[PDB]
Design a protein around this ligand. Sequence first.
Ligand code: HEM
Length: 295
Amino acid sequence: ITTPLVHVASVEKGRSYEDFQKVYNAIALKLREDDEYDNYIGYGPVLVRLAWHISGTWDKHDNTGGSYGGTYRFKKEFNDPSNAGLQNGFKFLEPIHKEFPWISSGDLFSLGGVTAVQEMQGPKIPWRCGRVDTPEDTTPDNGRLPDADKDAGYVRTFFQRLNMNDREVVALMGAHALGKTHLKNSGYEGPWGAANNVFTNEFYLNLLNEDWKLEKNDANNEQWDSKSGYMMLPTDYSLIQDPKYLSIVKEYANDQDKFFKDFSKAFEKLLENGITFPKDAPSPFIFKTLEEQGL
Ligand code: HEM
């Protein structure tokens, strides 16, 4: 009776690679322009978190949620407590959408994350168009995104719902090299590392090389703190408490190139979960950075 929905990707009318490269460039140029945001971190990290949160609502068992429908634009999902702070990323993308009103919301949200990773010198992320806006009654209920106050067993079980295995989980969590936690958003405070708007394997290096102490923060949540001024969420630290995760953490801490390759695959997969692509669909696009274009 409850059969899994099938969401078929549909290319926006008469649009192709050059069209989306222009959208990429507008995102990337505004990222360069609005350098002051969040004490000069810039909008890169929040756009990556936005792309992850609009995708991480997916439930593989009935194909509800996921990036396809662009449902973060609706009040119920926009106001999810797990999404506190992402309003800044939505407001950043509003002038992009006014300039390119033909792009679907899901395509714009997911492309924002790809642009941010690449412009912060991360790996190329192949990206496919064709997400189609769906009505407000398709918006997933709050509560599908993960709790940070949990252990490795919770992390492993949670990501099963997104069809992610151990390697994919550890790779995806490496995005916590970016940005920081804000007490007002999540009840956690502090960055994970020093180079907060450059995409590197710093997350794994800090996990393994810093001396961490479990401490209460000003919101009375416990987090792991180092003397360097970095922090780790409980779920972050669980990647070195669990023996299978620890092996992969060590692998990425020693080999940023392998991390980049695995992150690129898993992040594209995360953004595409729940979408059926016709065999006649165009191949994934690899957008050029502003630097590669002399822009
Ligand atoms: C168990 C899984 C995860 C948990 C529990 C988690 C939790 C969190 C929390 C609590 C914050 C702080 C938000 C704030 O206070 O502003 C955060 C930020 C962030 N998350 Fe994660 N996250 C997870 C996985 C991911 C994944 C898979 C990605 C991307 C691939 C990601 C990307 C980010 C980024 C870039 C930030 C920084 C945002 C900013 O600086 O504004 N996270 N996450």
